[model samples]
Target: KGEMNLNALFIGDKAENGQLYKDLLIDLVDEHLGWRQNYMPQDMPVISSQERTSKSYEKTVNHMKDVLNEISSRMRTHSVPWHTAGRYWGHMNSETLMPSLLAYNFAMLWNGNNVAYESSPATSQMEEEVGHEFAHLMSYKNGWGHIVADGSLANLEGLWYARNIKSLPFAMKEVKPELVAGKSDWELLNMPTKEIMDLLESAEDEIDEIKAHSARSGKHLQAIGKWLVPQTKHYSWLKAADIIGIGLDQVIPVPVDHNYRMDINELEKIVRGLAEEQIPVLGVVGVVGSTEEGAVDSIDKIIALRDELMKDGIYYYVHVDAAYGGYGRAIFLDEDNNFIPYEDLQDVHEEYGVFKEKKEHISREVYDAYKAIELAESVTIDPHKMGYIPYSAGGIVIQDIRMRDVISYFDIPALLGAYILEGSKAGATAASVWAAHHVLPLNVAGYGKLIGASIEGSHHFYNFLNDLTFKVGDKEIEVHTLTHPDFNMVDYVFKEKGNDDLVAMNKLNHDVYDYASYVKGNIYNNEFITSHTDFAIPDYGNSPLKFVNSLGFSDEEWNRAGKVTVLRAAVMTPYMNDKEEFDVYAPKIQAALQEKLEQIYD
Candidate 1:
């Protein structure tokens, strides 16, 4: 009875754990009420009992109830059933964890703003602790982090840090020549990110003055140089590039390999070419988990390339966009939050019952990628995504806490708002994350347990789809997954046994998506819910051609369509780990797909 059960962490699909949730919630409300009453016990009540019983007051309360009832009805009718198992695989979303929801609910009543410590003393401390927890999870021994509105803002802030830090040495040269007296403009521009950050430390007292003279503050915006990111990077990178004054053209897209990961060879070619042209690469963005394909870029390879490039006096900041897959790192850590040795990872997983029989999911390459996260200068993670917390809680962690000074808008110390893009942020979001971390520590015994189940479920789903074949009006339909998923998200497309027309295949998948999605009918009636994405030549280059060929589509067919649409299923729910649950829903999903295929073919 004392042992930890992962199912207890979530409100079950059928509200099996609803009683526990309700009891705890009631306690929290009662505790808050007591706190309010005890704050000034002698003072008169804000609303007297006599006033509360008035006819006008009753009418007002009834009207409020009516409005809330209608809103609740509308939500239940139209909302997607992300809480249910097997059906929801559309996006990086799932049911909010029990602790997170309760914490958010409790803190929301107070409406504390985390912009400053003066306004939200307790939650600000929670935010600070949350930052340290993220730092620990990401394996930053002395790093710091904070919450932002979402992954987009977290990415924008990462770019903001890179932009400001890249121009710091030059700024120091102008304001305090002695700080970088021996370093020429080219030398300063080519200096490693850590070196620049160290140089900034020397001129810490004169930061405000130097910032005024930096490229970010000056008219020479190009001095900040180009940003090299993978072609499979999130759209936020482009948006961040545009918003941070780094022209869209300067955000170069390095090509990816067949797995949709950044191609190290092409990346080296681009960096070497940039070096020859004397164009400083402001930073190199590594995607920990790509949006569409759930691909994990080889961060270890990226680091190695950086080290090799640095030997030749070419260096750039390293930022990992791990918003979608950041929390998956927990699977690498132990109960104490220390990274378990790769050799002993299997033993840990065996004990945890995660990837127990399916060990192929954690390949050495993928393991090394997560291990190298410690070497990154900054990372973007979303609590609302992988952390399974409430919405609007994205985070950015920097290896060096002092780096925050580079992006701060104010000179004043201890002001949360000074360093971030958002003002008047919600303390409830911070509390939600804080409570989640406390209830479920960011380690193997906690988040790792839940994430492991999801990954296992993903692998099971992948295998099921890979082997799926059925007949529709004498034509056999074969299901092909778009490469094995590096994480929980799976992208798949269906092909007829002998058909090779990419356009027709794309239409068939689109029809299935239309039928399963909220577009054509009542969402509640969907037998299986899934999302769709297209891989186009313009964005992905020829990387997807290999997968297309695997589906029996020729290059000519791919050339005619220029893109292939595939169904995306983000297996974010942990219930799929249960064999009984999986058996119950897998057939339903298969039946739904076969029904749709029969309609199209027969």
Candidate 2:
């Protein structure tokens, strides 16, 4: 507990103490092993050593050992060393903290299955408790939720809940007009999901029976509404529609603005167009920390869109996929857990409109993005991402607790399979997340402090990348940073002689990605460990094109490749915030890229 200080891990020089920490972890592992061997059912014995091994058994055993050793040796050379944490921007995975790792290992010893209380009574409660804490973290108090394997699953559940709740009023109205005849759409829409579920259960004797009858009568509220999301949304949303049988065409992609956020006006246009078609509005998704660019979509604007449409009785469920950036909301809160008002944050949210002009400790736009999450019907967040917990811990928090009762169908008391996607999941992930949350409460002084430092480090890296230049046999090569980072991720590509040939530029940048991040490339074992992403022309409409053009690339040149490939880096390592460490490390990264490019171009 004493060693679990945020300053020591986030702001301090980890390299200086890394070995000591490693040794401490090893000691703890060994201590556990020692106790397990000494205690327990000693009477449970394996085959005695005195028994002679048959030729078949010996051959199989020897072969197994050889295969195991061979597999272990090859596995040692796996993907980029993401745990070392400097130059990975491809995805939201980082070094799981010590506390979480310890808790995971301890929990795994029990092999608890959190599918139901009967199988995992204690862990089921733990998952529920952790869900409440996560709900509070997302600014929803007294909210109900449960942990899933990852963000993708949580997203599926969020949509599942929305789909079912929106169907209730229509289904009930068709089945028994008397029940909903007196209720207004607004009253029905705002009605507690449980109240609607209770009505359905009583009328049909079973909720599933109600759904079956509704479907038989052709009154099943199929997605008469469209599911909306920004162009920058994760691919999981597409998969969600297919899984839920909501035809792919129903999933509409909204345009993003120059900032990589969902354009409110564009969204309004689509929603109105759908209204004209008499298509019900299904839901609108706002991203807090998009996958490729870390762009925080303007959720407050999305909510405003919802509110404006409410006058017309066009209500849409809003979901925030803050999987990679949800915990960052801590930055907007005071130590006492009170939200710091936007007007009061002049230093952080000053009138700096452009991202480059952001010289404050944090940007106002960024702060506002985090603040908008409170208004969402539900949110998908990954404890494994920003929480620094171990793998496979994602959470969904609903603004209304009754959403659970509406979505869940308990045919058998033992069957909770209807409530979530994964019927059986590891309770160890819950333990890891719970332990991390307990050790570092979700507040500014704890997680907020760590996230803030990471943000600061990202700025430092971005500024350094912005000013980067190198000489390649008399040609002054300049690095073009793709976008001003909204969070701790920066992407850039090289431009030598202002290469207007889009194909060649793409190749050069691809070569850089190949050199730095390609696992099998020579001299790849260097200071940097980066990844790549594309800003395509079609998927995001013209927003990607506009962003590149703003950077001085002509439209004709951009069309040459149809995409811009940039070397991406997610500056998540807290140690990057240490000036003493980054001052040297950052330059080393610059030099490595410079040297590699010279070799590539030659």
Candidate 3:
């Protein structure tokens, strides 16, 4: 229920993990990964052990009161700016106005399915509005977005989109994966590089290993295909191929520049080579933000490449996986002034990272990345990551609504059939999102206001990382918080390691998580902020990148930058403003880490 009181809202606006959610967070980290000691800045006041009118509970509550008082008083005296889109909530609302909130409540009592008009008329309208909101966020023209259980299903929907496109006449003509005798990814008639990779991974031993003697006899293994990615480009293109059937092998990686954007010349050479060899190139998956390096591929240049290929009658889907950094598109656009670049941007560039080609976001490599986005057939923007929403929220914006109609699972109406996946959708979750949006509309002022603060906050992180260091090799987090941010996620390694294996170094982080989870007053310590992962880089450690880890060396860029592990903080929550909130609490992680690492790794 959206019945949180003003006092709670007051606490939430200031407290870590917000108000209603204080308890929920304790369970999440504890259940997933256990806690360690060396907790800094003290711990949360209460522990489950101190029930039954105990002095321990009393002490705990008093300690909590002290911390809460400090934070709440700051909230009262100082105002922290907010955002709601991908990084900042896109300036969307948190709840509908009072009357509208009540109206939404009445519908909940009935608990109807908004899947169809008959089942839920009002919800259907709300759903339509939400879809439009998503489309707008992705900069889609006349496209559509819908709520689903998750990105996996969204991915299936993407495959469903590609499947109905009916391009694979040869493969689909035969049923089993085994039926394709000597078929190699290179041999697929009309397959995209992405799609061919998808098939061979499903086929397993169909191709020779590229490295081994007879192993090299088979088609590329989708797994090791990532090796082909040029140091200049972000590699989620390969990751997406790994997902949705095509193994990474299908990805014939195109090279990129020092800026980590696709090198047009290299990409062109490959496209021409594939064309001459009669090899099919699946659609190109360009990214607005690579999860690891936080680099945005040149959408403008990529789209131009698509246009040139189209002249030769070659067609492929252009997908923008801007999950980490796409929201900045709206920020950079001259929305209020008709999409002009921010006028005073230059003055604040230093304090706010801007026009940073050094950190992997190659803004100029493709002058019109934003322009290409307009022409893109589809895009992926995750509100959960950048948008600062709770979690389990991702959005796929399809340029054409006809695409969904073509892949419609409800061929004969959903009422008459069983779904292949989840049934009885959570209207409450829908309501939650709706309420958030209502409170924070996804418009220029709304999203602009929200993300603007994040842009400012991200600059704070960029400048902050500058003070600390490690390996700034072929890949690292270069935050552009000023103009067009390469999304809010910035990744950098602990510089003190000086070319050492992070496995030993991560002991510090492990200790921090350990203490934060198990120790006292630290209940809200880990709170809304957290970390993620990617590949392991050789400079950090010479390990072959094999699993996908959301765990941390420290930051969340481990996935894209080829670094095995590093400390990754999402930093999406409003609590991380420069006003000493994170500075004070962030040290909890640092102190816990310092104690554990010096004792353990150091």
64-166: candidate 1 lDDT, tens digit per residue:
9999999999998899988887877788887889999999888887788899988888888899999999999999978999998999999999988888888
Model 3 per-residue lDDT tens digits across residues 230-279: 33333344444565455655656565443445677877787767667655
lDDT of each: 0.87, 0.71, 0.45
Segments in model 3 whose C-alpha atoms lie over 4 Å from true places: 1-110, 166-266, 326-328, 333-338, 342-371, 409-424, 469-485, 497-534, 537-564, 577-602
Residue lDDT tens for model 2, 1-602:
21235534421233555665566557766876776677765655466554446777788889999999999876665544555545444455556667777677877876688887677666666777787877778777667567778899888887787777667776676557577888865455544444665677567554555554442233444534678988878999988867765557779999998778899999999998887666777788898988888888888888887778867656788889988888888767654667778665434322211112235655677777777787788999888888888777888888767556566655222444556767887777777788787777686646765676677778778878786888888777778777788887777777766667666777878887777765436333655667787778777656777656755778887777788877777677765666665686776787777777887867
Separately for all candidates shown, the number of backbone clashes (residues 3 or more apart, or on different chains) is 0, 3, 80
Task: Estimate candidate 2's alpha-carbon lDDT, on a 0 to 1 scale.
Answer: 0.71
- Rank candidates, TM-score, best first: 1, 2, 3
- Tell me how far the alpha carbon of residue 88 in candidate 1 is from the true structure, in angstroms, after superposition: 1.7
Candidate number of the best lDDT: 1
In model 3, how many backbone clashes occur? 80
Model 3 scores a C-alpha lDDT of: 0.45
* TM-score of every candidate: 0.97, 0.87, 0.58
TM-score of 2: 0.87
